[PDB]
């Protein structure tokens, strides 16, 4: 049909060939996979700087070609473009897969906002930046979620920088990120997003302060049960703190959609002189 021949032609797309991929030094190694320095060769002679993300039955590898056929259809400027994967074999007969992503030297937006409080690391950051990040990651949201994709772990450290200082979201999918109805019924919805997203803005404007000071991971339920929620930032402005307060409101079908959102930032950010 029609929903098969649309699958087929993704996953075609986005498969590359493993001689055309040059592995570099290892950037990061944690427990789930590594990243990894890169070099892609293109279509037109010349290579390219990439990050490589390296992550068991053939059921969830087809399950990974299907859902990176996906990731790959996603075009836009403030979500990280999925260049392609590769499946390379370990000499025990385990899958390792891999997948390809522009290199982004600025690096995850957590960091940067921690780096930019010391000396060596870029400057203080102003209002208008900070908001320009939020707003960023606003219509990268607004455009998955009318597509209908939930992205499951949206938080400052998934948010990636690019030359330009652009902001996109990455790493698709945290107790203190999760919705107060993700974590009593196991359930996600795009709201449950946009719960997340008021948690990233919190982020920004604290310039990356962990949520919640002096609240435990295994309190956080319990917290939010009795109607807690983040506590507005010092020299926050008003307006921006009843923004990402809307995204925590207790019954999800009264927070928000992403398009709200994102034209109530732009026009504050319009305001600033
Ligand atoms: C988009 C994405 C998708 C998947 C995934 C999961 N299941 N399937 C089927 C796929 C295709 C996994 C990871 C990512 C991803 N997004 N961002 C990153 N990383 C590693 C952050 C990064 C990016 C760029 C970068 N440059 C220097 C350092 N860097 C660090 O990883
Ligand atoms: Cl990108
Ligand atoms: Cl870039
Ligand atoms: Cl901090
Ligand atoms: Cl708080």
């Known amino acids: 049909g029609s929903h098969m021949e649309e699958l087929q032609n993704k996953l075609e797309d986005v498969v ?38 390296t992550m068991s039955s053939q059921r969830e590898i087809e399950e990974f070609l299907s859902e990176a056929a996906c990731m790959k259809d996603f075009s836009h400027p403030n979500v990280i473009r999925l260049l392609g994967v590769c499946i390379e074999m370990s000499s025990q007969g385990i899958p390792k897969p891999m997948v390809i992503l522009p290199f982004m030297k600025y690096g995850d937006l957590h960091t940067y906002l921690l780096y930019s409080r010391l000396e060596t690391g870029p400057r203080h950051i102003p209002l208008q930046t900070l908001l320009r990040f939020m707003v960023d990651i606003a219509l990268g949201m607004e455009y998955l979620s ?10 400052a450290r998934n948010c990636m920088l690019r030359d330009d200082m652009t902001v996109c979201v990455a790493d698709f999918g945290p107790v203190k990120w999760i919705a107060i109805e993700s974590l009593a019924d196991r359930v996600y919805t795009s709201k449950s997003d946009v719960w997340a997203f008021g948690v990233t803005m919190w982020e920004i404007a604290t310039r990356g302060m962990t949520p919640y000071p002096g ?15 983040l506590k507005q930032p010092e020299d926050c402005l008003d307006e921006l703190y009843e923004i990402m307060y809307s995204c925590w409101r207790t019954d999800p079908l009264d927070r928000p959609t992403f398009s709200v959102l994102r034209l109530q930032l732009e026009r504050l950010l319009e305001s600033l002189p």
């Open 146 to 155: 009318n597509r209908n994709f939930l992205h499951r772990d949206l938080a």
């Open 16 to 53: 590359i060939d493993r001689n055309l991929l040059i592995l570099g030094r290892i950037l990061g190694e944690g427990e789930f996979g590594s990243v990894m320095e890169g070099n892609l060769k293109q279509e037109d002679g010349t290579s390219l700087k990439v990050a490589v993300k």
């Open 215 to 229: 609240v435990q991971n295994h309190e956080m339920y319990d917290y939010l049960l009795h109607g807690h929620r």
